[PDB]
Amino acid sequence: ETTRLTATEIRARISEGAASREEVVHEHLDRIDEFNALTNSFVELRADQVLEEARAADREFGSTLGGPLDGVPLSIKDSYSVAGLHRTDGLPVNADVLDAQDDVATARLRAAGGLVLGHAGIPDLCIRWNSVSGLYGAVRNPRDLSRTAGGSSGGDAANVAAGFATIGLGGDLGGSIRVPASWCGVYGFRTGPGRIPDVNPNGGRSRNVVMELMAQIGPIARSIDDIELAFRIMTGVDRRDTMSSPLGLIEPIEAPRVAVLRHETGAVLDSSVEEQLDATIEMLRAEGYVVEENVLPDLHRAPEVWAEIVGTELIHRVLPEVAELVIASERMHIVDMFGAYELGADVGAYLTALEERSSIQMTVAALMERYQLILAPVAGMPAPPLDFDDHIGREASIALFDQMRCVPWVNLLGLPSLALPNGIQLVGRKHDELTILAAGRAYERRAPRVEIATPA
């Protein structure tokens, strides 16, 4: 069935006349209807509408493929507007927010022929590594339904892992692509500054530049070719996003040196995660990369400064506004974890943190002239139980943060990173996305192909 196949494989079936686009969509919709009650990962569907799109293309063009995503079913995170779908942030108060226009990233996927099946589940506010909302409930991991799918792009990761869609669209502010992609055993690519514009023609709330500098859009998929396809389609300037650039993609570096991050950000790692890190080092070396351990300086401040900057804003701006609109577990995750790092009410403390961010960014940029890739864990543990961050208190929330210290430094410093299905990531410099994907292909050449999960 096409639910098990990559985008290239689906398109080959269509071009050979072995499947219609409508048949492909029906296969995915039927699988969703069978298993989505268990994962709760597709939270809003557009079944009739996407079948009409598929049929339209079948009738007009038949087996001739149009754009590069023609025939390919897609999952889109609730956060990214899709014309005719609701954009809620997980909140019951926003249940009536229905968008007239696609976001630019979504529009590019659809213009290329992509078939959007619906919107994917998220946590309230998209601030959580567990996709639990007031409006839709909890996303459950298709690999083990007792476990979190991660977050904030947990629904998209779950949809791709379950074979409900071929490619997903998420975003990453504090691991929000990489964490759920790894915990659901799929690829998740956080792009870097400039490449994919974040433009919502329906009117978003205005954001602090500091927060905008740390967030990037990216695809989730079961193969690197699908990651790259979606990445290339979405890349391109749009001057409605200040952060967008017309700079082209840069061809992969010849013989990049790889530095290994293990404990240098202070992360607390399970033995099983250390074993995957070691396995990935082995794979890269067998593919001819030079990989070096114990070359990075003490970077424990990097995830801390992320939490200070983000936490101060959540505690002093966001919670005061939305505390009554979010589920209690969301409020308490913010208070329990981000409350441990927030800087208090004094603007001077926040300004000092912003200076430290710049200092760390410059230090890491300088060392990445020698080590153009950093290989690191994503999470310090495999997918935890659904309740792992539910009303756990301050002490346990500090422990959770310590398990996640290989994640948010990437956001702080504005770097692209590919999460691999084994929970290890490849981080690159700004603008060096294709170098990252080349290293990803080295892992892909060595590890078994990603297979879909059947929720049970």
Add this chain to the structure above:
Amino acid sequence: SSHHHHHHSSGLVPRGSHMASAQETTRLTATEIRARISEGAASREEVVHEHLDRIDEFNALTNSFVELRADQVLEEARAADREFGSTLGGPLDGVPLSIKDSYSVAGLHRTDGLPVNADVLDAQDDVATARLRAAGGLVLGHAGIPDLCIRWNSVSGLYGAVRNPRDLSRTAGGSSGGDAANVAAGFATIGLGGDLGGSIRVPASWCGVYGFRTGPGRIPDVNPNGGRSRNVVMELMAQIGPIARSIDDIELAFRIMTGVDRRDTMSSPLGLIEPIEAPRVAVLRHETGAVLDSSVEEQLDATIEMLRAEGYVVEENVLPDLHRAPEVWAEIVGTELIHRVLPEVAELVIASERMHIVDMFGAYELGADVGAYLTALEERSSIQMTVAALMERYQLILAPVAGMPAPPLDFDDHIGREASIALFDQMRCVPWVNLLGLPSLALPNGIQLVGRKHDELTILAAGRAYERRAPRVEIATPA
């Protein structure tokens, strides 16, 4: 004179007679200096001596060149002469430069105007300086600044007050006042400054020269000696750029300094974008709430007519109410100055600088609550998005710089809160440009052309509508 051709376009007059009107190189543009060197009519050493001699005669009046490297630059010039003669090297070979105190020059001190920093001797050039020197530029020295580079009046504890060479009773502006004054006085051909709240445009306009604030990505700010770490918010609002007496010299310096350096997170490898075919121009007059003198409105109107004559479509009364834009700049900058900067350096800065910050920025600063600062950062993003959308239709904005011509030297000296608000209101066409991260060219008549991010060449092309029609910029002799 007899060693040169006397071109036939000059009918009848003796060659020697014609040449007896040839002005000293202190009056010439970079192209004219280079033509004289290439013809064998001047050596580089001669050019440098002419400038250093003029500085020695008149710099006690302007106080604009604050730290010279006379012996060193003379050695550079002699070395280039001895090796290469009348053959030009790089595109800036033979051209004397002024560099703002802020930007490292190897063997000079970077002080921020503060006597405590008189021992900060830099071993290396900043990247921007290095690029100018590698192209052949001859750095004469460092130029004057205000304490902390936060003032539209270049007054320091270390060097005293820069005075306007066009009228010594008036301010030269700031914070790049020394460089504007050096260029206006004919002490150097090109100056290098920076612009956080008008710090190039204001002194350039008040000194009657061109000043170009470049935009995001183009010129890297890299100090190999180790600068202080800065808030990204402040970094997003500041850009380096040249000050000169012609647009060719602006463009030459800009092109030399442009190029990626990954030691500056804001630097981009993006190339220059060719000028837009037929950009529409929007006129900013009172839409940011500025209080404008009649004389400034007359220059704005004159410039509209020059642009229309060149073929630009120029529209008035098309901008929305943008009075919040300069206010948000003052809120963001002021809060950092009052809650971070002054607590650390108040004892090291001159009282008039501290009092300018309290009197003016204290009117806008947000207090100690981080929530208020975060709110202002959101508003900055909102305004930026709004203006970016408008600038898809109006790719250039024509605006005053200051609301008045160069004020008296004491215009911001211990003036108090109410007078400081009035001064801010006169300057409201200035700092919105910084807030939103936009390039802008200030013309010598105190009017500016603002463009979108990455659109520097479109701006310079529009500036040439003025240069084609206006009298050439002439140097002033301080008296």
